């Protein structure tokens, strides 16, 4: 039941509604332009040219094409990253980034004839990521081919935790080297306890609406559900799940599930010899390293159960590639499509400038101010009708948090501590303006943004001949070499990905893709930050040798007399010397890879997700919207950035229409009215 084209994936997920936005299918809302604007010549800024900002630009283009003769939209897009595709009309990165969609091209002097691509950020896309595939269809067409991402379990995989080794494909014991594996048994216990059954008895530990999550996922994905059922999920049942479980970590939930299974006898004592608590702990940690289909979630054990449950409902692990050589092409293509679809009514200019501050000021028609610095640190100020702040939360904080929380007669804004020039604004209000009369409302949005959790992440890459997989010491599953390795060696998750520039001579050896503490533990060895090599011609050889050295472990396989050094050490050492690489998102200006919510974080992230509803408060007249995966319930997915972009543009339309929701299309209106408003007073 594997999808083979963009269109097949698109249609698969077209219906799916996430539990915090259960009254709308975002793909359906995005099918037609989101609404209508009054006649005018608008001046809009988008800060950030990543997935969020470019999707927002695309939707603005669609709106622009609907405007009457004499009307139009001008967009200034600010993009600070010198490597952005926006500024481009051995390891090469220049022109190959669109924020956290980021490719590194490995070549030997001629970039048009490369060896492989490292996908440094986004790489694998859920089947039911309906908005993702909607935009992929706009970019590439429905007919374009897609492939199954080679996740652990999708290709032959070796798993190592402590003394346990497994070699497997999927979850059918017939496809496991050891069909009696305790790993496969604990997977069944934890999946049963978290997901349960779509039919029959409820067996999950943490019900939603008194039933297993699998049953709720089928309603959220229904090709037609009760409207009433969706409303009750939105307003009652998902909120009640949050109230109960937002304070429970994933790690705690796994331990509860394993404890009950152990007490029932479904899981036996480990070795026959560990005591009760040691056995439970062993299983918790074993599952921790194994995961849900994308490698161990041990490093993610501090996320709320609520956050994990979003991913469960979404069947997140069932993922595909894009029909591209480099994922940045998706975003580049959407940028071009935006301009095409505006039909001449959208004009776009790119600024290679870092925004330092946003505010509302003055008494002119355009009051939405941006203060920015160019690549030689010259200051620039511009006023706009509307602004979309399409940057993740730690990048947004300095822009929105340094102006205070209420009216100020005058402020000299900018990066004065850097020695840079400031600019005087008069009659100043915060950019994220939730009240004329509460500094606390203005402070709540800013403080929430600034305390969202950016998960840490890093990727270590090298280039290897694909034929290295045919060495006699590389294990096989039914004649196919092992191509994914999930391990407690410190590397966490490793992938031998065939080059997309093509059977390819080379593969991208994703030696280590780490999250959270797994990333922290490596970071001292990266050498140069955020990228080693920092130059096009260097190689991160010393760093990479420390990764090879982590793999230099004696591994015992069942039936063998003695342990020998792990074969995967030999595989890593087969990578060529040149083009060894690490990128540390943690030491990038993003301050990490992507948002993941901790216990208690729902209320912070959800405030951000609902922020665009400020447009309902007509007199407030707030001109700023936010658009990033940080302002979604899908941090770490293009789907989240795209949802947030859709929210931002929907809100912008309502604000341009002075609070009138009838300006949104029928299908888009629930983007605004299906959420609890962020402004209680005034109503609207």
Binding residues among 556-585 for ligand FAD as defined by CB under 6 A: 585
Nearer to a copy of itself, 98 or 511 (CB): 511
Tokens of 517: 């503490």
Interaction pattern, residues 105-134, with ligand FAD; x per rule: CB under 6 A: ----------------xxxxx---------
Min dist CB 276 to a copy of itself, Å, is: 10
Q: With contact defined as beta carbons under 8 Å apart, do 585 and 432 qualify?
A: no
Min dist CB 361 to ligand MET, Å, is: 38
Binding residues among 621-680 for ligand FAD as defined by CB under 6 A: 628-629, 636-638, 640-641
Q: With contact defined as beta carbons under 8 Å apart, do 79 and 349 qualify?
A: no
Residue 628 annotated as part of some ligand binding site: yes
> Longest C-alpha distance within the chain, in Å?
82
The C-alpha angle with vertex 589 and arms to 583 and 594, in degrees rounded to 5, equals 75
Residue 80 annotated as part of some ligand binding site: yes
- Identify the residue among 375, 412, 426, 577 touching a copy of itself (CB under 8 A): 412
Min dist CB 619 to a copy of itself, Å, is: 14
Chain position carrying tokens 């599953």: 477
Residue 603 to residue 609: CA distance in whole angstroms = 10
Q: How far is CA 214 from CA 217, 456, 639, in A?
A: 5, 30, 21
Binding residues among 445-464 for a copy of itself as defined by CB under 8 A: 446-448, 450-451, 453-454, 456
Residue 122 annotated as part of some ligand binding site: yes
Residue 280 to residue 286: CA distance in whole angstroms = 10
Q: Is 495 helix (H, G, I), strand (E, B) or coil?
A: strand
Count of residues interacting with a copy of itself (CB under 8 A):
111
Interaction pattern, residues 276-305, with ligand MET; x per rule: CB under 6 A: ------------------x-----------
| DSSP notation for 527-585 | -SSSEESSSSS---HHHHHHHHHHT--EE--TT-SS-EE-HHHHHHHHS-STT-EEEEG
Q: How far is CA 18 from CA 310, 313, 314, 352, 613, in A?
A: 7, 8, 8, 36, 18
Interaction pattern, residues 365-404, with a copy of itself; x per rule: CB under 8 A: -----------------------------x--xx--xxxx
Residue 560 annotated as part of some ligand binding site: no
Interaction pattern, residues 351-380, with ligand FAD; x per rule: CB under 6 A: ---xx-------------------------
Residue 100 annotated as part of some ligand binding site: yes
Binding residues among 611-640 for ligand MET as defined by CB under 6 A: 636-637
Close Cβ partners of 494 (under 8 Å, ≥ 6 residues apart)? 484, 485, 486, 487, 509, 510, 511, 512, 513, 568
| DSSP notation for 303-358 | BBHHHHHHHHHTTTT-EE--SSSSTHHHHHHHHHHHHHHTTTSEEEEEE-EEEEEE
Q: Which stretch binds ligand FAD (CB under 6 A): 76-84, 192-200, 611-619, 670-678?
A: 76-84
Binding residues among 617-676 for a copy of itself as defined by CB under 8 A: none
Residue 387 to residue 43: CA distance in whole angstroms = 9
- Alpha-carbon dihedral of residues 554, 559, 560, 561, nearest 10 degrees? 110
Min dist CB 626 to ligand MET, Å, is: 19
Tokens of 92: 């090469």
Interface with a copy of itself, residue 598, by CB under 8 A: yes
Nearest residue to 43 (alpha-carbon basis) of 661, 656, 642:
656
Interaction pattern, residues 103-132, with ligand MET; x per rule: CB under 6 A: ---------------------x--------
Nearer to ligand FAD, 378 or 467 (CB): 378
Nearer to ligand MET, 287 or 594 (CB): 594
Query: Which amino acids are annotated as binding site for FAD, given as ranges?
Result: 52, 79-80, 100, 121-124, 355, 628-629, 636-638
Residues that bind ligand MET (CB under 6 A): 124, 294, 594, 636-637
Residues that bind ligand FAD (CB under 6 A): 47-53, 78-81, 84, 99-101, 121-125, 354-355, 390-392, 395, 457, 585, 590, 593-594, 628-629, 636-638, 640-641
Query: Which amino acids are annotated as binding site for substrate, given as ranges?
Result: 124, 513, 636
């Amino acid at each position: 039941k594997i999808a083979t084209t963009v269109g097949e994936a698109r249609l698969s997920g077209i219906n799916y509604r996430h539990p915090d936005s259960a009254l709308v299918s975002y793909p359906v809302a995005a099918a037609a332009p989101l609404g209508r604007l009054p006649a005018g010549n608008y001046r809009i800024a988008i800060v950030g040219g990543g997935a969020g900002g470019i999707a927002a630009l695309y939707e603005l283009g669609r709106l622009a094409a609907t405007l009457p003769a004499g009307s139009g939209i001008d967009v200034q897009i600010y993009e600070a990253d010198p490597d952005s595709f926006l500024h481009d009309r051995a390891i090469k990165v220049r022109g190959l980034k669109a924020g956290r969609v980021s490719a590194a091209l490995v070549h030997n002097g001629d970039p048009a004839s490369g060896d492989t691509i490292y996908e440094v950020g986004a790489m694998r896309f859920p089947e039911i990521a309906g908005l993702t595939w909607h935009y992929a269809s706009a970019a590439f067409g429905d007919a374009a081919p897609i492939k199954v991402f080679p996740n652990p379990g999708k290709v032959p995989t070796e798993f190592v935790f402590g003394n346990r080794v497994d070699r497997y494909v999927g979850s059918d014991p017939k496809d496991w080297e050891d069909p009696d594996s305790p790993t496969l048994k604990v997977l069944g216990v934890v999946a049963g306890g978290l997901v349960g059954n779509p039919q029959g008895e409820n067996v999950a530990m943490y019900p939603i609406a008194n039933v297993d999550p699998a049953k709720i996922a089928a309603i959220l994905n229904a090709a037609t559900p009760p409207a009433d059922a969706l409303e009750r999920i939105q307003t009652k049942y998902w909120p009640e799940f949050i109230a109960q479980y937002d304070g429970l970590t994933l790690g705690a939930a796994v331990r509860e599930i394993v404890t009950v299974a152990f007490e029932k006898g479904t899981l036996p004592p480990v070795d026959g010899v560990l005591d009760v608590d040691e056995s439970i702990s062993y299983y918790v940690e074993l599952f921790g390293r194994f995961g849900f289909g994308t490698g161990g979630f041990k490093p993610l054990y501090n996320i709320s159960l609520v956050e994990m449950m979003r991913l469960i409902l979404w069947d997140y692990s069932n993922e595909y590639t894009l029909p591209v050589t480099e994922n940045v092409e998706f975003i580049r293509n959407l940028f071009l499509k935006a301009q095409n679809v505006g039909a001449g009514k959208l004009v776009v200019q790119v600024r290679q400038e870092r925004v330092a501050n946003a505010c509302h000021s003055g008494t002119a028609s355009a009051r939405a101010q941006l203060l920015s610095y160019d690549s030689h640190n010259a200051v620039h100020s511009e006023a706009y009708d509307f602004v979309i702040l399409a940057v993740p939360h730690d990048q947004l904080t300095p822009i929105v948090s340094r102006s205070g929380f209420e009216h100020a007669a005058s402020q000299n804004l900018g990066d004065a501590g850097l020695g840079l020039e400031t600019h005087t604004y008069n009659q100043v209000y915060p950019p994220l303006l939730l009240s004329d009369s509460s500094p606390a409302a203005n402070a709540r949005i800013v403080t929430a943004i600034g305390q969202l959790h950016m998960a840490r992440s890093s990727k270590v890459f090298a280039t290897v001949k694909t034929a290295a997989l045919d060495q006699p010491w590389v294990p096989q599953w039914r004649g196919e070499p092992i191509k994914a390795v999930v391990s407690d060696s410190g590397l966490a998750a490793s992938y031998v990905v065939p080059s997309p520039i093509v059977a390819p001579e080379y593969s991208s050896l994703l030696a280590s893709y780490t999250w959270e503490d797994d990333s922290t533990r490596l970071r001292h060895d990266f050498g140069l930050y955020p990228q080693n090599p920092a130059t096009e011609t260097g190689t991160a050889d010393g760093m990479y040798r420390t990764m090879v050295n982590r793999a230099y472990r004696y591994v015992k396989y069942a039936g063998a007399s003695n342990a020998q050094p792990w074969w995967f050490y030999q595989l890593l050492a087969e990578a060529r010397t040149a083009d060894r690489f690490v990128f540390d998102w943690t030491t990038n200006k993003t301050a990490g890879g992507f948002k993941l919510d901790m216990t208690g974080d729902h209320h912070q992230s959800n405030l951000c997700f609902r922020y665009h509803t400020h447009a309902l408060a007509a007199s407030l007249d707030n001109r700023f919207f936010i658009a990033s995966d940080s302002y979604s319930h899908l941090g770490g997915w293009l789907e989240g950035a795209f949802m947030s972009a859709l929210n931002a543009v929907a809100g912008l339309i309502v604000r341009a229409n002075r609070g009138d929701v009838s300006a949104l299309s029928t299908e888009a209106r629930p983007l605004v009215i299906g959420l609890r408003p962020v402004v209680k007073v005034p109503a609207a």
